[PDB]
Amino acid sequence: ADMEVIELNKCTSGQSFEVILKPPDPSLEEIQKKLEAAEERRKYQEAELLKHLAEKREHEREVIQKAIEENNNFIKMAKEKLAQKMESNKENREAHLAAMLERLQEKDKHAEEVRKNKELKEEA
Amino acid sequence: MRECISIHVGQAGVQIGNACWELYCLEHGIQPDGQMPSDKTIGGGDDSFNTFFSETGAGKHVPRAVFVDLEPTVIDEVRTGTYRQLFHPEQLITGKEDAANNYARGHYTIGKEIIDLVLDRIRKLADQCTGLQGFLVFHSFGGGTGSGFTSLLMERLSVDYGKKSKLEFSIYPAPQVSTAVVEPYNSILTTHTTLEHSDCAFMVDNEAIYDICRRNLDIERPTYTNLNRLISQIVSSITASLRFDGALNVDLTEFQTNLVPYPRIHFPLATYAPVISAEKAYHEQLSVAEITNACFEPANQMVKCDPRHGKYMACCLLYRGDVVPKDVNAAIATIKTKRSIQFVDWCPTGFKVGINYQPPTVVPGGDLAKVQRAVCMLSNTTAIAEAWARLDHKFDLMYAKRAFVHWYVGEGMEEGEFSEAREDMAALEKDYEEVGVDS
Amino acid sequence: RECISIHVGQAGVQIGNACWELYCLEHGIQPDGQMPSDKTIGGGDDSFNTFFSETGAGKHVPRAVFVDLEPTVIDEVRTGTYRQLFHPEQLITGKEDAANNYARGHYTIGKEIIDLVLDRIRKLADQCTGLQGFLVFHSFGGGTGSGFTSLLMERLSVDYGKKSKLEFSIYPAPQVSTAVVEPYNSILTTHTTLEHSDCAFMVDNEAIYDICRRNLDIERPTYTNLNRLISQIVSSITASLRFDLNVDLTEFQTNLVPYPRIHFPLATYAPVISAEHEQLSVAEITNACFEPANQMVKCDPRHGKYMACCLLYRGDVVPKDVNAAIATIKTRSIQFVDWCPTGFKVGINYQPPTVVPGGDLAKVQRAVCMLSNTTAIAEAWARLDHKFDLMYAKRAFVHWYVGEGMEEGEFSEAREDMAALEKDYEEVG
Amino acid sequence: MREIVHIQAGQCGNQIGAKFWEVISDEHGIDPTGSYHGDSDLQLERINVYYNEAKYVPRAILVDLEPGTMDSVRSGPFGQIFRPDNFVFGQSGAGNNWAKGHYTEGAELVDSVLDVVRKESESCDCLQGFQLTHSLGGGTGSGMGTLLISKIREEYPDRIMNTFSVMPSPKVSDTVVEPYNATLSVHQLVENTDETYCIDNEALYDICFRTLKLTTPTYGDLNHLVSATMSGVTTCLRFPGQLNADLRKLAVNMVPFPRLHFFMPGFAPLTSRGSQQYRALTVPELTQQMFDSKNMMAACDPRHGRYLTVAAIFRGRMSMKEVDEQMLNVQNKNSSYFVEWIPNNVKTAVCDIPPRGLKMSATFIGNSTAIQELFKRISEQFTAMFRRKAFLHWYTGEGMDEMEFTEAESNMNDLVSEYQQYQDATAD
Amino acid sequence: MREIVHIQAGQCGNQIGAKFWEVISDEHGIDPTGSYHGDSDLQLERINVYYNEATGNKYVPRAILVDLEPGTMDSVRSGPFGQIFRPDNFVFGQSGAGNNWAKGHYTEGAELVDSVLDVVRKESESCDCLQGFQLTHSLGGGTGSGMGTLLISKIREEYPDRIMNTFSVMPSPKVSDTVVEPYNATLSVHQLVENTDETYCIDNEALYDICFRTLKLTTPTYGDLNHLVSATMSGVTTCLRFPGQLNADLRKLAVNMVPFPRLHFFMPGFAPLTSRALTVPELTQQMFDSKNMMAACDPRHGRYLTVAAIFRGRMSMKEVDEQMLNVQNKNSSYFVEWIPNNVKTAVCDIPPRGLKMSATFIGNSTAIQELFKRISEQFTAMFRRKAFLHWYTGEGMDEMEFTEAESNMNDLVSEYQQYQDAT
């Protein structure tokens, strides 16, 4: 049990020795560049999201717009179709009565020539 | 908010509006003088009954309704009836000459005389509503006013109110208790023009209602008010979730979304249970199941068509009285097992349910017995293509010989309108057939 | 030559409290801050003043700063019964934590907070006539102990490259851990502070848990029972500077750390006996440090060659007994590397080891702590590297880090560095 | 609303017209003085349709070329109830000359007729239309009557024109030219009226003689039949119910084609004025006898053709369910006699108040293709005379040309042809 | 101290959200007027997470109530805890959604989504450090599903760095409100993939099935269905509401439970299911059982990516830990190998009212693809025939949004299965 002990520091409440059994750059700007590069790509992520949310806002505007267009197109086509058939119905009904009363007038004129013919007969 | 304006057109629509508003008044306890001794909020307030009623400064509760007929005798009794003081006189609008069973006269020659006057009173009632839901249009199919004027009104409403919701409650033509031979003409023509303008049309016919009253009330021949007061229960059951605070509601938009699978397929038929005579009134009450099973029995359909002949596309079951959701869900559960009741393969859920706890009431002294529970089913089934085919065949028998067409041509109509209308009815028959085939 | 302690994250703070609690009773300092055995009031240059500075009123104030981004743990110290010892300045808290996310603790919020903690450090450093360096206590798996500590470590080197930096780190244990991303956080933080730490004592939470259950006969030990045993091992390590071997912080680097990267020595402690008799041999406790059952990090020292090792006794120990004790152990053939001499640096401290009164571990006449830089500690790295690889292969969870501005390439820049450290370990093994 | 202006022209028009005012005024409880004396209040709810309240005065206009008839209708009971301003007469009758009524002397006083028509229509809340009673065999009621009809349509084109026309028969008058006057009137009627009720004197003679077993019937006997059916035809016009007393409605439902608006009225029970009525006919007896050829007011057998449309009105206290059963029974026990291409072409009405003396009665109005028998017979007698152009100078002397006669008989021959076409028309 | 803003939307969302508030208020000893009446400071240590200190000595829930109709929100004001909610926090319209996702998300929802956000911003300014939001709503209706996702999207625009969690009731034919439920659910599943950090999948089919079969009730009440949800939500949120060894927040759980951004749909579980306190071995056994899953999916059809379990009541944690690794070791194959230690648990010795002991399961299982597969089959059945599609076209929507939402949901099903066969 041969062990080269070396009596090192020793004092009142401590001592120490070493027994031997056998012999045998720093850059802060580069730091903050990494921090800032991470912050900037975070902002790139936020911007690309906010752009994505803008297209969905715009899509909600387009959907609501065409809903207004459908309601407006429905109104005016109904308006014009009702006006077209009401006017076409008036001309039809007026033409029927105008024709019926022209034949009635023709009948009247025939009664006057019947009376005319009799009077010329009476001159005999 | 969420108000609804009821428009009653023609004799059928006006006398059905008489029965409904009388029943509404009894359900809400509104006296014949217009005063409601159960609404503390004088001259205002936004409780649930106010969807169908407005309030005056004096307390009178006035209906959000317009009664219009090209002829005054039927509306005159409203002006002289027990409920005369319910309406301001401007709400009851009459001409002096009816459409004489002629769609052309209702839609063109006679109807044009009062159409704007009608529309401007619609606008004034709509001016008194903070959030208009839509319109309920009551009319028959067969009369000149019920077909011609209603179609003209529906077209005008679309102009003035856009795509706002318009729902119809229509009486389907029935030979058995018919009144005019030209009913097939008027019905095909009015269906053709109000098709694009109506969001949904609840349908009954007086034959099936007549037979039901005969069979289940022991009446040798039911009178028109017998039919009407039974119809009033159907209508009140449809509007119950909008006039009463309810756990599960069905508003005007909910009817549309759930019952109309395609724009042209918007004709659900009504059904109602139970219908019990007052003399055998108080025996042991019927289940919640039994009245639900009754809605799918072919004998109880308010339109005489056979549901076993077609597939169900959508079923709206509206309960009132002593019924809670667990009872309904169980009753529906076993109906979902019934092999005889078939649904289209493109509607897996297929059901819509509203419930109201207030009990149903009937006019005192009537033939109908008051019950604890009641249900009205509005079924959109392909089986009513039979009803369209029956009407279209009668149309064909007379149009082939052009019988009675001279009455329509004389008032400005062209024969082209007749073939357009019928061709569209042939497309409707084919549409009902096409939506029924499997995927 | 004074020394500054830094506790980052919940593990660093709670452990730090447990360590300062023992320091006070070892030196007989009372909770109000008074020390009846300190006669040079308000000043002096005693041995225990390397870790405490003195008020004008005689209160003894630890040279420590407590950092956490969440305030629940610091609020304990803020309000605890050893609350008087620290000035409100010494305690720093944000109010949102790093969310078990290294990148959140390092890149995101750490940019917002490091100037504050660095300012508070200089105020303590300015209170140092001579200052050797820093002792930083942190977890490996936690977001704050991972991300912020690494950010603070590099800033501490550019600011005070003069000084030395020693680590007391908690190795994530599958039984006692809180996050599945802890392998991620560990690999990331060691890669970035490896170049900035001189020595790093790591603590495998499973080993202590196993130590307390077997040796204390405890059901499942609390964190406090873990933390108190840690305090015994930390105190013995730091005892050398508190009673002026290992009296300089560069003596830690020189005695136990032959090269820079290999600075992860294994710590062992004996004895550990329940408070629920007369003490055991000096050779008994010495023999126990070579049994793997007492190790702080679960690894097989027989599978590794020691490069250096250090034995600090505390209690009634005299040299002739250990020389005798270290003669008999040479009857386990413990191979050492051929460029380092087989042997043991030995330090003795005559005052018995103290204990928290009422604690589970009993008061003992003699205790020993062995600090060995074995290459066997590399297997602890290997287990961590494997679990990292399993999740990173499928790129699981990495979206949380990239979402904080961290490039995905940092994961493998850190991973390949870990591969080099494990390879370098067996190059000398 | 719905006021009706009544006009009666010629001898027959004023005779059955005065008898028709007699029947309904008693039904409405109005004495010859003209004041209400009725038991029930249902009698005056629709009294305004035919009567003007001044005391109620018939909205009637009495016309004739022969001035003696004015003093005859007044001299009859209920003579003073007619307004004196409403009487419009000429200097002397047309002598069975259709041209005199339509073109020459009739045209002289037609302006004075339209005066009081205008005067009576101006006092109308909402005028339904006009009914005209007249014969087609004479010259005034037939010639001037049809001229009056076309004059009125000129002033009121959208109003309903109905007529009660009495067709000539050799069994009651031997006047030779009446087939001429009827054909010329039918020529006018087919284009200028909305419905005419074809009251055949030939049928009126057969009923009194063969069924009523009457020795030598007097125009009073025949007119009792017409006044009974005329009241029965207008029951729902004069009495209220769920039914609207309307003219356009009936015409729209009963007239499938504009030219086929000639109706075959029927009545049950047929009875003499002084008969005892030992029992009241029950509903099956009324319904079966109503569709019988013996009860037709036109000399036509309904089973020689098919019904286009049929409207029936029952009178008295009866069960409406029984009416529906009997009415449906005869519909499909004789289903072949109803065209299949008009569904539900048979609809009936029932009123609680019965006619005077009869507790049970039924009135029939059918649009039948069998009415071509009536027009065939008139055309047969017309072409017999016109083949030899007999007595044509009486008409051409007044200014008419012969081709008006050709157009009248051709158009009447088209009418019978059109009835036969629909008689054999198939559903497909 | 790290507050949470709660938002309930629609018919279902307001009614299960109202029971959630009644249940946790009972746990925290807060009565209807809002004043404390419990017995322990533990009910108050983390009370600011869900409540605001009122002007007097009362607590007001940081809750916003949203609906396009005033019906059901008026009924919750009529409830026993109706008076506790802030009156200005009731945001309602009169138009309704008509059970239409389009009306909720586009036309009608736009007319109200600004006023709701004004309330969100108000309470956000009333927080020392807001951690995020939680939304209760269904996916089958119009308001909760349609307007709810629109609200979640506009919240993410204003507070992009905050956590968003939803409790989403998945529609089922066994308990249905409308026939277009396949449309509304599919359309908003699309949205929850993008705009929430985690979603708890409450399946009305599982709720009914559990409520019927293993609890023996002829037919279940709506309160019975909601009772399962409120107890489940209560257990999901105990660590946020009660102090312990960990200071649990929203983000940490999300960081630990969601390995990939899209797979953030969780299978909730509870034990025991009550209509005799339970032993710790039985809770951990039934908690992992398919019959205790509030989503109608069999866990044995998938592999757990990550799992969090919460135990409540007086018990020994070594019992809990041994049992939790027991079933982890017993069923080694139902957890993924490339996520080591993917099952972590927490214990809070305060049990829920009416139970001495209970446990709650939060699982990130790929077996949940069966849920989205069930909805997708009902969707195609209707969409193949384009049934009821005209009510969505009429509001300005196009067909391609339906197909985009459909294939996105199938994409989610595909990649769930991708990591199901991952080694």
Ligand SMILES: Nc1nc2c(ncn2[C@@H]2O[C@H](COP(=O)(O)OP(=O)(O)OP(=O)(O)O)[C@@H](O)[C@H]2O)c(=O)[nH]1
């Ligand atoms: N259920 C029911 N049906 C009715 C009622 N009144 C009439 N009808 C039916 O309605 C159809 C006839 O239409 P009406 O309403 O009477 O006619 P109108 O609208 O007044 O039209 P015109 O009189 O021609 O101007 C037929 O099918 C009748 O059976 C009624 O009170 N109740």
Ligand SMILES: Nc1nc2c(ncn2[C@@H]2O[C@H](COP(=O)(O)OP(=O)(O)OP(=O)(O)O)[C@@H](O)[C@H]2O)c(=O)[nH]1
């Ligand atoms: N020995 C011991 N280990 C602890 C203690 N507290 C936490 N840990 C360990 O620390 C690891 C997680 O790091 P923490 O310190 O808890 O978290 P942190 O540093 O506050 O970082 P954040 O994620 O921002 O909260 C886990 O593996 C725990 O095992 C403790 O008191 N004693």
Ligand SMILES: Nc1nc2c(ncn2[C@@H]2O[C@H](COP(=O)(O)OP(=O)(O)OP(=O)(O)O)[C@@H](O)[C@H]2O)c(=O)[nH]1
């Ligand atoms: N049923 C019935 N037929 C009558 C009556 N009076 C006349 N007729 C018929 O009417 C036809 C003759 O026409 P009238 O009405 O008498 O002649 P008118 O209309 O007065 O015209 P004129 O005498 O030529 O100026 C004859 O065929 C008679 O059969 C009557 O009171 N009852």
Ligand SMILES: Cc1ccc(C(=O)NCc2cccnc2)cc1NS(=O)(=O)c1ccc(C2CC2)cc1
């Ligand atoms: C049922 C009936 C019976 C009588 C009268 C009645 O007496 N009206 C008063 C009047 C007017 C004109 C002339 N005389 C009398 C009216 C009706 N109802 S109906 O709508 O007109 C109608 C509808 C359908 C048909 C079909 C069989 C074809 C017929 C009738």
Ligand SMILES: Cc1ccc(C(=O)NCc2cccnc2)cc1NS(=O)(=O)c1ccc(C2CC2)cc1
């Ligand atoms: C263990 C645990 C269990 C429950 C809760 C808890 O209830 N939090 C409150 C809350 C937050 C959000 C939503 N709802 C509720 C928190 C934790 N601790 S943990 O670190 O976050 C964590 C770590 C690792 C995992 C698994 C991968 C293995 C899960 C959770």
Ligand SMILES: Nc1nc2c(ncn2[C@@H]2O[C@H](COP(=O)(O)OP(=O)(O)O)[C@@H](O)[C@H]2O)c(=O)[nH]1
């Ligand atoms: N569990 C539960 N589900 C509900 C409740 N109310 C409605 N639902 C479900 O929610 C969906 C309909 O949504 P709902 O909330 O009524 O529509 P909204 O008002 O437009 O949001 C359907 O899947 C219903 O089954 C409820 O109170 N509890």
Ligand SMILES: [Mg+2]
């Ligand atoms: Mg009418």
Ligand SMILES: [Mg+2]
């Ligand atoms: Mg009020």
Ligand SMILES: [Mg+2]
């Ligand atoms: Mg609803």
Ligand SMILES: [Mg+2]
């Ligand atoms: Mg922490």
Ligand SMILES: [Mg+2]
């Ligand atoms: Mg000193």
Ligand SMILES: [Mg+2]
């Ligand atoms: Mg004469």
